[PDB]
Each structure stands twice: as C-alpha cells, then as structure tokens.
C-alpha cells in the first residue's frame, strides 16, 4: 500500500475492530497464540509495521523490551505519546520511523543490547503484504540475520474470502481481488495494495536469501513465516 494511504487516514480503517469479521478476529487470536508460544525466547519484540503500537501492551505486560517500526509519522507520534503518557523509559520502549526495507540500517547489532537469538522481528496483521518490494524486505531481513515472525494469510479461496469480507468493510471507492503467480492481491484506488503470497511462491524466495523459514498455518486463514532458534 501507499504511504499517503495511511498518512491521509484511509489506512486507519484496517485496525478498526468494528470492521473485523469472525475469521479475522480468529486470525488475530491465533497470531497472539503463536507469539505467546515463543514468549520465553523473546527479550526484544521489534514490531515491523507497528502503527501506534498494536503489541506494545503485550511487551509492557510481559516485561519485554519493545521497538515499534513504521514509516507513517502520525503512527510513530501516536505510539510516542502513549510512552510519554505512562512515563515508560526509552531504554526499554522505542519507536523508529522507517521501512522494513532498511531494517539492516535501523537495527545494527550494537543498538540492540540483547543477544540476536532473543530478538524477534514480528510483522503483525500482514504488514509484510502491504510493503512495496518484498524482495528488498527479504534481503534486509537476511542482512539483520535476526529471528522473525511474518504474520500473513494463506491463498486458499477461504483465506481470500476472509480477507475480502475484512477489506470490503473499509468501504473504499472499489475493491479488486486478483490471483497471479505470486499470490492474492487486494487493491483500492485510495492507495490500498495488500498481498498474501502463495506458500509455493514465497518459500523459495525466503531460501534464496538464506532464511531457514517454516510456513506455520494458524487460525484456518493464517500462515506464520517463522525463522530463528525459538521455532525449533
Ligand atoms: N515498508 C514498510 N515497513 C514497515 N511498516 C510498513 C511498511 N509498509 C507499510 N507498513 C505499515 O504496516 C502497517 C499495517 S499494513 C496491514 C494491512 C492489513 N492489516 C492487512 O491485512 O493487509 C501500517 O502501519 C503500514 O504503515
């Protein structure tokens, strides 16, 4: 999707809970169960596509270090206002205005202060599917060498119908679904462009960049692209 899409507020509709059908609520619950299931191996959660910080509350509750990464300034400002409000220290909870494309520049080893194995680059609610160039994101991920959890969707007709039911409740000028060699693409002329990549297309792309990924299916319509020792 476009930066303008989110900047101008159209993108806000995608985290309005009133717009979540049952299959997507189930998806978000399943997303959290996978995160919980490796929680004991996470000291630093890096939320990639964080918005205002959807999993900040998770990190606060579980006593984890937090970095929200999002290229939308108004979302970074919202997240930072939340940290100031509760008086949370910067050395534990931060926001970084940037793209997943430059993750390797945003997260140099020294800046972590946590072993690589206890870090998780968590891309929630199909943030990865809304990124301009997935090939750039995968290379950036490769160069960080950090464990990651890319939460996205399956490309079964049922998964596509779940996404259609979710996106259509945002009431954009029009909504197009297309299936091609890469995956299932939803577009709207507001600047919405959301992909779910076929398991058969993306797994080879992952391995090409040396990422030892497993596509873990969850909550009927989800697949979690999981790499790192906590997924042994
Ligand atoms: N290159 C990028 N790097 C990091 N975050 C990005 C990004 N491109 C978009 N995002 C952010 O990802 C967040 C969620 S987009 C997710 C859309 C929707 N939940 C879906 O199911 O497809 C937004 O805040 C957006 O600004």
Numbering used by the authors: 2 to 233
Mind quoting what the paper says about this structure?
AZE synthases catalyse the intramolecular 4-exo-tet cyclisation of S-adenosylmethionine (SAM), yielding a highly strained heterocycle. More recently, AZE synthases have been discovered in bacteria, namely AzeJ and VioH, which are involved in the biosynthesis of azetidomonamides and vioprolides, respectively. Interestingly, they show sequence similarity to the class I methyltransferases (MT1). Each subunit adopts a classic Rossmann fold, consisting of a 7-stranded β-sheet (β3↑, β2↑, β1↑, β4↑, β5↑, β10↓, β9↑) surrounded by helices α4-6, α8-9 and α11, a topology that is typical for MT1 enzymes.
In contrast, we were able to obtain crystals in the presence of SAM or S-adenosyl-L-homocysteine (SAH), which diffracted up to 1.95 Å. Our analyses revealed that AzeJ forms a homodimer, whilst VioH is monomeric. Although the sequence identity between AzeJ and VioH is only 28%, their monomers share a remarkable structural similarity (backbone root mean square deviation (rmsd) = 1.8 Å, 72% Cα-atoms).
